[PDB]
C-alpha cells in the first residue's frame, strides 16, 4: 500500500499515484470524511480512506475562514485519525509502505514517522519557488526576500533568471501581507531533510539550475509534469467544444482570470473589454455569479466573438487545435497544462507562485508575456489588448509559439518511457514495491 495525502478538497498527486499503480503499487487516496461523503471516489486503481478534519458534515474551510484556524482543526483531528488509519491498516494486513504527502501538512510526516511509515514529500510548486522558501527555512536567507537576495542566487547559478520586485514570491517578499502562508511556505522545509523521498511536480529541462539545486540540496526528484498520460502522448495507460470546433486553427484566446472579489468587478469589465477590443475569438471562463455582475453592454459586445462559460474542460480546451493562447493567472498546474499542449501564455499573476512563474514564462521560457499593471495595480483594457496582439500577431509571435512547442516536446519526453521524470518515478516505485 501507498498512501496519498494531498491537501483535502489533488490531480497531480493522483496522477503520480496512477503511475505508481502502473508499476504495481496499490494506491490509496486519503481525504476527509466530508469530501468523501460529498464527491465521488477516484475509482480504479485507487482505494480511498478517510480521515477527519473536525468537520464531517460541513466544509470547515467555509466554517473557519482564517488560514491559521482551519489548519489547527485539521491537524488536531487529522493527525489523530491518520494515526488510526495507519495502525488500522497495519493490523488489517495492509501496512503503508510509504506516505506521499503535501508538506503543507507537516504533521503527516510526524504521524507516519511515529508509525515507522516511510515519507515522501510531494511539492507541487516549481523548483524556483520551492528553493527560495527552502533557503529561508534553512536560514541562508533572511526575510524579507529582496531582488538583491534573488540576484545573488542568480549569480551563484541556482536561479536561472534575475527576479525583480514583482517576480519574487510575495509570501516571503512581503511576509507581513500574509504571515500564515508565509510561515507555512517556509515550514514545508523544516524536517524535510528527514524524509525518505522528496518529489517535485516539474521536469528538469524546464528548470535545470533550480531542479539541480533542489536535487543536490534536498534530494528532490522531478516527477512531472504530473498530468494524464494521454496529454503527454504516453500510451502505457459539451457546448464549448462544439464552439471550438467551428473556430479557426490557433485563433482562440482561452481566458481564466480566477476568483474576483466584489471590491473589484471593475477588473472583469477591463478584462472583457480588452478581449472584445483584441478582435480575437475568445472562450472566457467566468463563474455564473460573477457573470451576472458584468454590464449588459459588455455581454452584448462579447456575443460577437466570445463565449462565456462557468467552467470548461481546461486540458481538453488547451489541446484543441482552435486554441491560440491562454490568458491565465499562471497557477502552476495551469501553466504545466499550457506547456504540455504548446500554448503561448499571457500571464496575469495574482499571488503565491504566480508572479515567479510569470517571470519564468516571459524571461527564461519565452513562451509569452506578462501583463503590466499601472501605478495603482490595475489591469487596463489597453494592456490586455496589447498582450493578446503581442502574442498572437506581433513580430515576436513565432518566437512564443516556437518556445512553447520546444517546451512541450521536452515535457512529453520527460514523462514518456525513459524520460528524466519517468526514471525518477520508476526508481521511486522500485524502492517500495
Ligand atoms: O474552468 C476550469 C478551471 C480550472 N480547471 C482546472 O483546475 C486546475 C487548477 O485550476 P486553477 O485555475 O486555480 O489553476 P492552478 O492555480 O491550479 O494552476 C487546473 O488543473 C485546471 O485545468 C478546469 O479544468 N476548468
Ligand atoms: C488553508 C489553505 C488554503 C490555501 O489556498 C492558497 C492556494 O489556493 C493553495 C494553498 C497552498 C492553500 C491550500 O494548500 C494553503 O496551503 C492553505 O494552507 C495557498 C497558500 O497558497
33 is written with which cell numbers? 470524511
The helix (H) or strand (E) run that includes residue 429 is: helix 420-431
Residue 225: cis peptide before it, omega within 30 degrees of 0 = yes
Residues 343 and 328 in one domain: yes
Which DSSP string do the residues of 133-187 spell out, in sequence order?
HHHHHTTSS-SSP-HHHHHHHHHTTSSSS---TTTS-HHHHSGGG-HHHHHHHHH
Query: 11, 46 in Cβ contact below 8 A?
Result: no
User: What is the greatest pairwise CA distance in the chain?
Assistant: 66
Active-site residue identified among 44, 53, 102, 195: 102
Query: 303, 293 in Cβ contact below 8 A?
Result: no
CA 428, 421, 201 angle in degrees (round to 5)?
A: 90
Sequence ranges of the binding site: 124, 259, 311-312, 329, 332-334, 337, 353-354
Rounded distance between C-alpha atoms, residue 343 and residue 328, angstroms? 11
Q: Which residues pair with 327 in a beta bridge?
A: 255, 346
Half-sphere exposure of 370 (CA within 13 A, CB side): 23
Q: Which residues of 379-405 are buried (b: 16+ CB within 10 A; e: fewer)?
A: bbbebbbbbbebbbeeeebeebbebbe
Residue 382's SS3 state is helix
Residue 184 CA to ligand 2 centre (angstroms) = 9
Short-list 132, 101, 144, CA closest to 119: 101
Short-list 424, 432, 397, CA closest to 223: 424
Rounded distance between C-alpha atoms, residue 262 and residue 418, angstroms? 49
Short-list 305, 294, 287, CA closest to 269: 294
Examine the residue annotation and report whether 194 is marked as an active-site residue of this protein: no
Residues 332 and 273 in one domain: yes
Rounded distance between C-alpha atoms, residue 189 and residue 270, angstroms? 40
Count of domains in the chain?
2
Query: 414, 224 in Cβ contact below 8 A?
Result: yes
Q: What domain range includes position 433?
A: 1-235+414-433
Q: Could you tell me if the CB of 104 is within 6 A of ligand 2?
A: yes
82 is written with which cell numbers? 491518520
Residue whose Cα lies nearest atom 2 of ligand 2: it is: 67
Residues 276 and 300 in one domain: yes
Residues 213 and 292 in one domain: no
Residues 95 and 181 in one domain: yes
Residues 377 and 430 in one domain: no
Query: 98, 89 in Cβ contact below 8 A?
Result: no
What phi, psi does 146 have (nearest 5°)? Answer: -115, 165
Residues 247 and 212 in one domain: no
Which DSSP string do the residues of 229-271 spell out, in sequence order?
GGGGT-TT--HHHHHHTTSPTT-EEEEE-----TT-SHHHHHH
- For the chain, state the CA radius of gyration: 22
Q: Any long-range contacts for 173-182 (C-beta under 8 Å, 24+ apart)?
A: 173/144, 173/145, 173/146, 174/144, 175/143, 175/144, 180/66, 180/67, 180/68, 180/71, 181/67, 181/352, 182/143
Residues 240 and 167 in one domain: no
Residues 428 and 392 in one domain: no
Query: 254, 326 in Cβ contact below 8 A?
Result: yes
Q: Could you tell me if the CB of 70 is within 6 A of ligand 2?
A: yes
Sheet holding 252-256, edge to edge: 306-309, 282-285, 252-256, 323-328, 345-347, 368-370
Q: Could you tell me if the CB of 256 is within 6 A of ligand 1?
A: yes
Rounded distance between C-alpha atoms, residue 424 and residue 197, angstroms? 11
Residues 129 and 37 in one domain: yes
Residue 29's SS3 state is strand
CATH code at position 319: 3.40.50.2000
Rounded distance between C-alpha atoms, residue 388 and residue 394, angstroms? 9
Residues 262 and 370 in one domain: yes
**What phi-psi label fits residue 248: left (phi over 0), alpha (psi between -120 and 50 degrees) or beta?**
beta
**What phi-psi label fits residue 112: left (phi over 0), alpha (psi between -120 and 50 degrees) or beta?**
alpha
Rounded distance between C-alpha atoms, residue 15 and residue 224, angstroms? 9
**Resolution of the PDB structure in angstroms:** 2.2
Short-list 338, 337, 360, CA closest to 349: 360
Short-list 304, 323, 298, CA closest to 240: 323
38 is written with which cell numbers? 460529498
Q: Could you tell me if the CB of 333 is within 6 A of ligand 1?
A: yes
Residues 24 and 94 in one domain: yes
Which DSSP string do the residues of 61-82 spell out, in sequence order?
HHH--SHHHHHHHHHHHHHHHH
Rounded distance between C-alpha atoms, residue 216 and residue 361, angstroms? 25
Residue 79 CA to ligand 2 centre (angstroms) = 18
**Closest ligand 2 atom number to CA of residue 353:** 21
Rounded distance between C-alpha atoms, residue 186 and residue 171, angstroms? 9
Q: Which residue has the cell 512529453?
A: 412
Amino acid at each position: 500500500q501507498v498512501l496519498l495525502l494531498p491537501f483535502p478538497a489533488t490531480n497531480p498527486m493522483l496522477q503520480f499515484g496512477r503511475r505508481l499503480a502502473y508499476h504495481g503499487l496499490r494506491p490509496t487516496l486519503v481525504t476527509t470524511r466530508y469530501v468523501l461523503s460529498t464527491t465521488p471516489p477516484p475509482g480504479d486503481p485507487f482505494r480511498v480512506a478517510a480521515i477527519s478534519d473536525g468537520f464531517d458534515d460541513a466544509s470547515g474551510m467555509a466554517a473557519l475562514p482564517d488560514p491559521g484556524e482551519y489548519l489547527r482543526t485539521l491537524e488536531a483531528h487529522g493527525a489523530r485519525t491518520l494515526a488510526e488509519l495507519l495502525l488500522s491498516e497495519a493490523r488489517a494486513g495492509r501496512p503503508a509502505r510509504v506516505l506521499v504527502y503535501d508538506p503543507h501538512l507537516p504533521w503527516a510526516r510526524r504521524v507516519a514517522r511515529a508509525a515507522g511509515v516511510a515519507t515522501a514529500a510531494f511539492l507541487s510548486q516549481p523548483c524556483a519557488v520551492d528553493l527560495i522558501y527552502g533557503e529561508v527555512c534553512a536560514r541562508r536567507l533572511a526575510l524579507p526576500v529582496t531582488p538583491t537576495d534573488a540576484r545573488g542566487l542568480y549569480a551563484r547559478g541556482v536561479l536561472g533568471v534575475e527576479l525583480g520586485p514583482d517576480d519574487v514570491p510575495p509570501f516571503v517578499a512581503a511576509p507581513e501581507l500574509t504571515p500564515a502562508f508565509c510561515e507555512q511556505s517556509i515550514e514545508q522545509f523544516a524536517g524535510l531533510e528527514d524524509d525518505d523521498d522528496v518529489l517535485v511536480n516539474s521536469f528538469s529541462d524546464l528548470e535545470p539550475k533550480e531542479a539541480a539545486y533542489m536535487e543536490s540540496t534536498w534530494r528532490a526528484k522531478t516527477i512531472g509534469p504530473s498530468l494524464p498520460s494521454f496529454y503527454l502522448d504516453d500510451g502505457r495507460l459539451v457546448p464549448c467544444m462544439e464552439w471550438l470546433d467551428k473556430q479557426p486553427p490557433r485563433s482562440v484566446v482561452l481566458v481564466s482570470y480566477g476568483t474576483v472579489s466584489t471590491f473589484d468587478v471593475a477588473k472583469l469589465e477591463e478584462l472583457g473589454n480588452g478581449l472584445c477590443n483584441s478582435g480575437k475569438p475568445f472562450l472566457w471562463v467566468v463563474r455564473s455569479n460573477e457573470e451576472h455582475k458584468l454590464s449588459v453592454q459588455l455581454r452584448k459586445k462579447c456575443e460577437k466573438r466570445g463565449l462565456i462559460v462557468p467552467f470548461c474542460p481546461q486540458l481538453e480546451v488547451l489541446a484543441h487545435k482552435a486554441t491560440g493562447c491562454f490568458l491565465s493567472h499562471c497557477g502552476w498546474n495551469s501553466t504545466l497544462e499550457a506547456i504540455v499542449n504548446g500554448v503561448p501564455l499571457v500571464a496575469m499573476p495574482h499571488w503565491a507562485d504566480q508572479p515567479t512563474i510569470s517571470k519564468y514564462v516571459e524571461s527564461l521560457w519565452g513562451m509569452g508575456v506578462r501583463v503590466q499593471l499601472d501605478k495603482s495595480g490595475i489591469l487596463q483594457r489597453e494592456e490586455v489588448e496589447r498582450c493578446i496582439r503581442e502574442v498572437m500577431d506581433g513580430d515576436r509571435k513565432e518566437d512564443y509559439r516556437r518556445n512553447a512547442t520546444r517546451l512541450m516536446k521536452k515535457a512529453k519526453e520527460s514523462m514518456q518511457e525513459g524520460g528524466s521524470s519517468d526514471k525518477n518515478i520508476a526508481e521511486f516505485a522500485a524502492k517500495y514495491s
